[PDB]
């Protein structure tokens, strides 16, 4: 389907990754001395689960979260730099992340993420490492 606003611009996004099972944390904090630390909030207590998509329109990737049954959009997070505010590693274990999503009303929210596998989360990282390796004046 077409986007809610269109003026014949380059409103595309090219698929980079899919993962079969993913869980989220609507976390309380923003900025602790070490980052976010999953150990501080909800690392065993998700609020939603579904399916992962990652897409990219040029230098910008979009983490898009999908329903496990029908593929319907839960949330989306635009990123133009990695590491950044739009995808961060908690403190260090890349079993988890934190991303900045849109709420779809002209506003944003931060959610933590936890995966079904430690390697599926490390591949969520690598899907963005190999997206930012050829930009960022490298």
């Amino acid at each position: 389907g077409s986007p809610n606003s269109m003026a014949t611009e380059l409103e595309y996004e090219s698929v980079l990754c899919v993962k079969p099972d993913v869980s989220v944390y609507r976390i309380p904090p923003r900025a602790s001395n070490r980052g976010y630390r999953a150990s501080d909030w909800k690392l065993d207590q998700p609020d939603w689960t579904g399916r992962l998509r990652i897409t990219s329109k040029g230098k910008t990737a979009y983490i898009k979260l999908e329903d496990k049954v029908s593929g319907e959009l839960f949330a989306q997070a635009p990123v133009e730099q990695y590491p950044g505010i739009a995808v961060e590693t908690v403190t260090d274990s890349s079993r988890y992340f934190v991303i900045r999503i849109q709420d779809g009303t002209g506003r944003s929210a931060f959610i933590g993420i936890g995966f079904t596998d430690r390697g599926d989360a490390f591949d969520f990282n690598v899907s963005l490492q190999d997206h930012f390796k050829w930009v960022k004046q490298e």
Binding site: Q45, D92, S93, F122
Partner: peptide, 15 residues
Amino acid sequence: SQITSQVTGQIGWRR
């Protein structure tokens, strides 16, 4: 609650 699987940091790694 269900389990504890704290984010790594004493080695700070990957695979």
